[PDB]
Amino acid sequence: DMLSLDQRIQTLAYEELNKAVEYHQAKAGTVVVLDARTGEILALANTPGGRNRAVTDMIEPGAAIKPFVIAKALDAGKTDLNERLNTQPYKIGPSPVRDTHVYPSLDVRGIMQKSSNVGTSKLSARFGAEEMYDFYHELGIGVRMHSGFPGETAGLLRNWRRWRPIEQATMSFGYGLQLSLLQLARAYTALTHDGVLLPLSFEKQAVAPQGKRIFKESTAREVRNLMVSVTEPGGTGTAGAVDGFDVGAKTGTARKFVNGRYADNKHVATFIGFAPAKNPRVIVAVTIDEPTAHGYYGGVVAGPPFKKIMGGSLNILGISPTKPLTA
Ligand SMILES: CO/N=C(\C(=O)N[C@@H]1C(=O)N2C(C(=O)O)=C(CSc3nc(=O)c(=O)[nH]n3C)CS[C@H]12)c1csc(N)n1
Ligand SMILES: [Cl-]
């Protein structure tokens, strides 16, 4: 049998996912676990029972898309690692562009670490609309996965000719475009596989299949290091840190679109990360739908199951820790 599924990881993922969903009294949840070098899908878990939401359900990614805007800006030389960007909030007409805190300025590392919508939108604004549209398209947004499961759709990437000026701003921190958790996890292979986006596979891969280069290898390596700051003190994703490893991750918290408004009530909490951060072996992605108890942010809600799924996955795959254990 040549199937990529690993039953121990799949069982680990399902149990931790259901604990998190129950503890936060959430409506639903999904997990994807990938081989970070080949794109093999090691686990897909969904709750409550029924359809494969990891493949079928399109979500807005929120700040989980920010790593790719930051990488693109660095890759194209439109920013660097020492620029400090004014990150004061502002508005375009009625629409605000603001962070949860007012940071007067941040470098690119701070934009990632703090999850600055303002910083990301200003980096994105250095590109034209059609450029960015093509960029989201080559990340696979709007491109069907052909996983073999029914109910799968391509996702949403609106035509660039219809973008209002505010739209390109808000798309850069995860508004307006839609993708499945599988498409989102797939995009993170461009960061783990040294700039090369992988197709993903449900069968064991003897080699890493031929991918498509999105970023230079140096860009991917620098961005992975920025993402380690997310799980260290000062970042939004400390709940996902794993003993004996450096973890690059990104949190996301998206207001749900109820009828015709973005609810300040209901949220989707996402945590996606990879380890070992220098030479990744595993990607773990977790999305918790509408938590109602014990917090609703991505770090607090989906961070804890990420940490237990990642740590156990590395243990199951025999990945040696890169630094002394302290737990
Ligand atoms: C509620 O805001 N709605 C947004 C949006 O701007 N989301 C951004 C995003 O991904 N965010 C994240 C985060 O990184 O988790 C955060 C997390 S900050 C945080 N994390 C904790 O774990 C914690 O205990 N406390 N705090 C303060 C701010 S909302 C923002 C949105 C984007 S698309 C969409 N439909 N909604
Ligand atoms: Cl490859």
Residue numbers in the entry: 235 to 272, 286 to 574
Provide passages from the article that reported this PDB entry.
PBP2 is an essential peptidoglycan transpeptidase (TPase) that crosslinks the peptide chains from adjacent peptidoglycan strands during cell-wall synthesis. β-lactam antibiotics, including the extended-spectrum cephalosporin (ESC) ceftriaxone, are analogs of the d-Ala-d-Ala C terminus of the peptidoglycan substrate and as such target PBP2 by binding to and reacting with the active-site serine nucleophile (Ser310 in N. gonorrhoeae PBP2) to form a covalently acylated complex. PBP2 is comprised of an N-terminal membrane anchor, a putative pedestal domain, and a C-terminal catalytic TPase/β-lactam–binding domain. The TPase domain of PBP2 contains a central five-stranded antiparallel β-sheet surrounded by α-helices on both sides. The serine nucleophile, Ser310, located at the N-terminal end of the α2 helix, is spatially adjacent to the β3 strand of the central β-sheet. β3 contains the conserved Lys497Thr498Gly499 (KTG) motif that twists during β-lactam antibiotic binding to form the oxyanion hole for acylation.
In order to verify that the reduced affinity between tPBP2∗–H514A and ceftriaxone is not because of a loss of a direct His514–ceftriaxone interaction prior to acylation, we determined the crystal structure of the noncovalent complex of tPBP2∗ with ceftriaxone at pH 7.5. tPBP2∗ crystallized in the same space group as the apo structures, and the precovalent complex was obtained by soaking crystals in a ceftriaxone solution prior to cryoprotection. One ceftriaxone molecule was observed in the active site of each of the two molecules of the asymmetric unit, and a third ceftriaxone molecule was found at the packing interface of the two molecules, away from the active site, as previously reported. The R1 aminothiazole ring inserts between the protein core and the side chain of Tyr422 of the loop following α8 to form parallel π–π stacking. The terminal amino group of the aminothiazole ring is capped by two hydrogen bonds: one with the side chain of Glu307, located in the loop preceding the α2 helix, and the other with the carbonyl oxygen of Arg502. The C3 dioxotriazine ring of ceftriaxone, which is normally released following bond rearrangement upon acylation, forms parallel π–π stacking with the side chain of Tyr544 of the β5–α11 loop and inserts between Tyr544 and the loop C-terminally to the α10 helix. Finally, the β3–β4 loop adopts the inward twisted conformation oriented toward the active site, where it forms interactions around the aminothiazole ring of ceftriaxone, and its conformation is essentially the same in both molecules of the asymmetric unit. Tyr509 appears to play an important role in stabilizing the twisted loop conformation, as its hydroxyl group forms a hydrogen bond with Glu307 and its aromatic ring forms perpendicular π–π stacking with the side chain of Tyr422.
